Amino acid sequence: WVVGMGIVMSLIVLAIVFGNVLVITAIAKFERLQTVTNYFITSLACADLVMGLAVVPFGAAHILMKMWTFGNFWCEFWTSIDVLCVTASIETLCVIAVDRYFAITSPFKYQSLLTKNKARVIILMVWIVSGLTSFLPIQMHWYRATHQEAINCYAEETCCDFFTNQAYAIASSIVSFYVPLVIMVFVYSRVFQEAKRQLDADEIKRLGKRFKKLDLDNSGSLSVEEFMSLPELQQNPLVQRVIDIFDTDGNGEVDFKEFIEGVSQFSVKGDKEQKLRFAFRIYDMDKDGYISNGELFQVLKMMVGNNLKDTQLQQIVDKTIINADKDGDGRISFEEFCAVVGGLDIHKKMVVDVKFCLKEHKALKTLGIIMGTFTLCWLPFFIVNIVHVIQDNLIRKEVYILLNWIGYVNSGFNPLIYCRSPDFRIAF
Amino acid sequence: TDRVVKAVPFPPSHRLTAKEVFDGKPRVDILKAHLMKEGRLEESVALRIITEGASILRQEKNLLDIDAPVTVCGDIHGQFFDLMKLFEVGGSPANTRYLFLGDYVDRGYFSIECVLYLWALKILYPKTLFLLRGNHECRHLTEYFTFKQECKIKYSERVYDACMDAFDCLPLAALMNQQFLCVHGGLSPEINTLDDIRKLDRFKEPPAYGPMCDILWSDPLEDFGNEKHFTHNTVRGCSYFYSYPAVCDFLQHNNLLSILRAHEAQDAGYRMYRKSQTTGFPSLITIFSAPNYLDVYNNKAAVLKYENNVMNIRQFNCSPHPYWLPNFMDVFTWSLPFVGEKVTEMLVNVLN
Amino acid sequence: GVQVETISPGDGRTFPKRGQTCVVHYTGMLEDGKKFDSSRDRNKPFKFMLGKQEVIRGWEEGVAQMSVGQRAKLTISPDYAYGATGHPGIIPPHATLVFDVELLKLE
Numbered sequence: 081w082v083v084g085m086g087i088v089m090s091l092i093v094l095a096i097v098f099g100n101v102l103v104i105t106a107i108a109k110f111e112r113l114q115t116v117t118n119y120f121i122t123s124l125a126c127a128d129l130v131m132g133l134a135v136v137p138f139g140a141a142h143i144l145m146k147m148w149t150f151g152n153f154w155c156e157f158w159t160s161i162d163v164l165c166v167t168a169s170i171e172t173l174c175v176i177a178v179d180r181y182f183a184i185t186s187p188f189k190y191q192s193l194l195t196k197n198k199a200r201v202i203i204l205m206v207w208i209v210s211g212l213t214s215f216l217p218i219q220m221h222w223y224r225a226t227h228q229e230a231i232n233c234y235a236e237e238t239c240c241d242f243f244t245n246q247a248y249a250i251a252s253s254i255v256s257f258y259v260p261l262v263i264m265v266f267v268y269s270r271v272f273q274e275a276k277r278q279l280d281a282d283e284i285k286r287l288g289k290r291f292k293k294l295d296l297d298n299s300g301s302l303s304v305e306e307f308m309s310l311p312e313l314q315q316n317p318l319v320q321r322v323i324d325i326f327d328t329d330g331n332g333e334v335d336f337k338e339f340i341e342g343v344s345q346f347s348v349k350g351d352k353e354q355k356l357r358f359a360f361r362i363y364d365m366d367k368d369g370y371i372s373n374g375e376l377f378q379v380l381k382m383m384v385g386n387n388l389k390d391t392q393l394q395q396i397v398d399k400t401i402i403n404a405d406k407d408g409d410g411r412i413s414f415e416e417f418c419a420v421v422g423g424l425d426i427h428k429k430m431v432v433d434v435k436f437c438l439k440e441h442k443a444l445k446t447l448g449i450i451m452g453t454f455t456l457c458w459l460p461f462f463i464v465n466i467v468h469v470i471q472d473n474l475i476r477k478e479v480y481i482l483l484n485w486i487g488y489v490n491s492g493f494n495p496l497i498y499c500r501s502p503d504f505r506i507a508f
Numbered sequence: 509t510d511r512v513v514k515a516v517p518f519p520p521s522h523r524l525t526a527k528e529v530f531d532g533k534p535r536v537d538i539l540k541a542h543l544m545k546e547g548r549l550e551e552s553v554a555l556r557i558i559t560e561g562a563s564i565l566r567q568e569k570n571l572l573d574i575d576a577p578v579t580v581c582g583d584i585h586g587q588f589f590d591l592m593k594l595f596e597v598g599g600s601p602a603n604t605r606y607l608f609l610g611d612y613v614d615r616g617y618f619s620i621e622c623v624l625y626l627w628a629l630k631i632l633y634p635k636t637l638f639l640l641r642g643n644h645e646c647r648h649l650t651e652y653f654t655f656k657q658e659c660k661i662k663y664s665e666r667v668y669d670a671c672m673d674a675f676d677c678l679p680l681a682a683l684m685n686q687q688f689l690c691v692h693g694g695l696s697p698e699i700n701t702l703d704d705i706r707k708l709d710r711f712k713e714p715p716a717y718g719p720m721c722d723i724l725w726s727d728p729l730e731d732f733g734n735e736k737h738f739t740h741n742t743v744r745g746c747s748y749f750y751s752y753p754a755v756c757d758f759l760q761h762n763n764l765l766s767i768l769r770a771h772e773a774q775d776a777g778y779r780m781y782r783k784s785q786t787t788g789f790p791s792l793i794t795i796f797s798a799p800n801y802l803d804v805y806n807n808k809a810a811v812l813k814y815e816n817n818v819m820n821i822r823q824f825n826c827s828p829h830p831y832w833l834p835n836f837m838d839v840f841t842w843s844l845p846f847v848g849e850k851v852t853e854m855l856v857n858v859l860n
Numbered sequence: 861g862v863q864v865e866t867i868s869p870g871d872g873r874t875f876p877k878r879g880q881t882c883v884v885h886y887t888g889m890l891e892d893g894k895k896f897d898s899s900r901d902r903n904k905p906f907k908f909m910l911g912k913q914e915v916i917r918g919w920e921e922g923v924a925q926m927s928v929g930q931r932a933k934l935t936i937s938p939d940y941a942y943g944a945t946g947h948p949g950i951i952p953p954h955a956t957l958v959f960d961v962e963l964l965k966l967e
């Protein structure tokens with residue numbers, strides 16, 4: 081019924097807008113999820129938020145009222161915004177793919193050469209290229225055909241059934257969703273090839289052999305009692321804490337997928353920021369993101385044992401926190417920590433003989449999921465468009481809109497994939 | 509949680525921006541009760557206090573002339589929580605007056621608070637609390653010891669520079685009741701008559717030698733009556749000893765009765781030296797009013813009190829205080845190297 | 861290296877084993893006597909275990925020579941002190957240290 085369809089469209093628009101705004105705020109506010117990849121994600125979220133907010137409600141009104149009483153000019157504007165949003169999203173996807181390829185093939189070059197300004201420049205460049213490709217042909221009327229009822233719909237304000245020029249369809253599908261599609265497919269296939277080859281570079285295999293030698297329970301995961309099997313590892317005070325840094329999945333067990341990621345956090349050539357972050361994470365007893373007074377006292381109480389009175393330790397902790405608060409919250413963040421520490425040069429004291437940087441493997445499956453979802457959602461419409469080019473029109477006009485709506489609805493799929501990620505989940 | 513042990517009080521975390529400590533009489537009771545509580549002050553108000561104290565001190569003479577009913581006191585060395593006990597023992601400054609002989613700053617964690625309280629109290633009472641100058645009030649000793657770091661951590665270094673520019677103007681002789689002389693160290697061979705300390709300017713950092721450096725660094729013999737003035741010392745290595753004949757000749761040429769000083773720590777808190785045969789009062793008296801010096805000596809302090817031609821001595825006792833880490837290290841700088849060492853050891857052991 | 865020159869030696873019939881914990885009231889300084897830390901500024905003995913390498917090696921090979929109650933005076937060289945790296949906050953690099961340890965009990 082009409083009311084049900086209207087309610088469905090209202091819910092869809094509300095969900096899209098809310099999710100995209102949530103993602104934008106989560107990236108912008110916390111100041112820790114500000115990687116260049118996250119800036120590209122922000123551009124993509126802006127693109128699909130624009131398409132949601134502007135296009136989806138009005139196309140819903142068109143399909144509901146059965147008459148489009150908004151105007152010929154407004155029709156041109158709406159269709160051009162539609163084309164712009166789709167093209168911009170598909171181009172930023174391949175930009176992300178090539179970015180990740182360059183980041184994996186040689187981490188140092190990407191780390192040094194690419195900066196925030198370059199990210200903004202490339203984002204604006206791709207956005208303006210897509211925007212030109214979408215505005216320019218539409219407003220200049222390259223797509224209106226000769227069929228008389230098409231001319232009537234052009235003249236009549238109510239009718240906006242898109243009508244191709246038998247040439248506009250081909251040129252736009254193959255300058256917007258067929259070149260970038262194949263590019264973002266094989267580039268990211270090479271990304272998986274390189275990741276799979278790098279994960280087994282004769283070094284990780286030795287770590288796997290040692291892992292399987294240390295795994296007494298033979299269950300495929302390391303528990304805490306297995307780590308205190310080592311006769312010179314038991315007396316360590318701060319062993320438990322380090323386990324809780326490796327145990328990023330929260331299940332109570334450490335397995336080979338995250339053991340190497342934990343060890344690779346320490347390297348001869350690893351980043352200074354990674355080691356400083358690891359040093360910070362010892363004090364976060366709940367991974368909440370902030371160092372409380374109870375955390376900063378219970379961490380210190382297991383190192384000093386009973387060499388200082390309880391009251392003396394509490395007093396000095398109080399004074400430290402009071403002199404470290406630069407925002408009045410009462411709990412130290414990572415920026416305040418890096419203001420306090422930094423200059424000690426302690427990142428040079430956390431070194432292990434391993435030589436491999438598995439940093440760009442934490443954000444490969446989610447991006448692949450995004451690409452696969454986008455292709456699965458949007459390719460059927462373009463294949464139906466390429467069938468319908470020919471006036472064979474095997475069946476059309478009431479299949480052709482449901483596929484445009486399947487294409488529209490996928491913009492809500494990205495925030496769910498983001499919230500599947502742990503850091504984004506805790507961010508929201 | 510928020511606080512694992514709560515029985516210990518919390519330091520107030522709001523500074524005072526010259527609106528409550530002042531009125532321009534400064535408010536003293538609230539300043540005591542807020543500095544007693546591990547509070548703090550704004551930077552500009554601290555500069556104002558120190559500059560006003562310097563302005564009052566500079567106009568003072570170079571050889572203070574004091575009236576009789578005084579309560580002489582020794583060197584404190586930053587022990588704030590014992591400075592209040594001193595004030596409740598010897599009577600609050602409202603009714604009785606004080607003459608602080610020795611230094612205040614180095615070798616203690618609450619020295620900036622102590623000097624702030626003393627100079628506010630001097631601002632409010634300008635003719636009933638006299639301050640003198642000690643050896644620990646220079647640019648060498650304080651930078652060497654734990655005062656420069658103290659100002660750098662608690663406040664800005666500009667406070668430290670103002671504090672030195674204001675210590676550089678204290679008086680140094682403080683004659684008392686036309687009978688005594690009250691110097692921080694002792695005599696000097698280049699100083700023979702009282703007028704000789706009415707001439708030299710005190711507005712410069714003490715040199716390593718001369719009349720001023722030998723009045724703030726000197727030290728008397730431990731064997732008065734030694735076989736035969738100007739023998740050098742080894743404990744300081746910077747000025748001269750002086751035996752009983754020197755003090756006796758100084759008190760015979762100039763009609764006085766005794767000299768007071770505040771270097772040598774006394775387990776009883778005071779010491780009256782060999783009796784002068786001319787009159788009957790001891791020629792040299794040593795005061796010391798810092799209980800538990802360096803927190804280890806386990807002595808007890810003392811406070812002389814002069815009244816009705818009688819010197820009666822009030823004994824003293826220690827008092828508890830909060831705890832600061834050595835050299836004012838926060839816990840992150842305190843324990844980070846240990847964290848790194850333990851993490852590295854565990855990982856280099858688990859891998860093989 | 862490290863040299864023990866006792867001040868008030870006590871009973872020598874008890875020596876620190878490798879598997880025991882020694883309790884001491886250390887009052888350390890630098891070479892020129894500028895005190896930087898002490899265990900009497902707090903009212904608490906310092907308890908440390910041999911064999912395990914947490915104290916500077918100067919303690920490890922300088923406290924072993926002592927006995928019960930024998931106050932001593934350690935002159936730790938930069939080889940057995942914190943060495944070239946030093947310690948942030950307190951001790952400058954290339955420091956020779958002087959301690960006043962006093963073994964009291966063994967547990």
Ligand SMILES: C=CC[C@@H]1/C=C(\C)C[C@H](C)C[C@H](OC)[C@H]2O[C@@](O)(C(=O)C(=O)N3CCCC[C@H]3C(=O)O[C@H](/C(C)=C/[C@@H]3CC[C@@H](O)[C@H](OC)C3)[C@H](C)[C@@H](O)CC1=O)[C@H](C)C[C@@H]2OC
Pocket residue numbers: 380383384385387842843845846849886888896897906914915916919941942947950951
């Ligand atoms: C909360 C975590 C810290 C944890 C703190 C305590 C249990 C409190 C305990 C009273 C230490 C004091 O804290 C008030 C304080 O004692 C000093 O003042 C000191 O007189 C000193 O030199 N001592 C202490 C007496 C034994 C010898 C030596 C020491 O070996 O100390 C050891 C030491 C620092 C080892 C270093 C570590 C760095 C490496 O580079 C180096 O390797 C060469 C070896 C101490 C026992 C460590 O095992 C334990 C800790 O550090 C240091 C000047 C700084 C030190 O605070 C850090």
Ligand SMILES: [NH3+]C[C@H](O)c1ccc(O)c(O)c1
Pocket residue numbers: 162163166167249252253256484
């Ligand atoms: N409503 C049209 C549909 O969204 C669409 C998307 C991209 C295109 O290149 C196109 O011609 C049509």
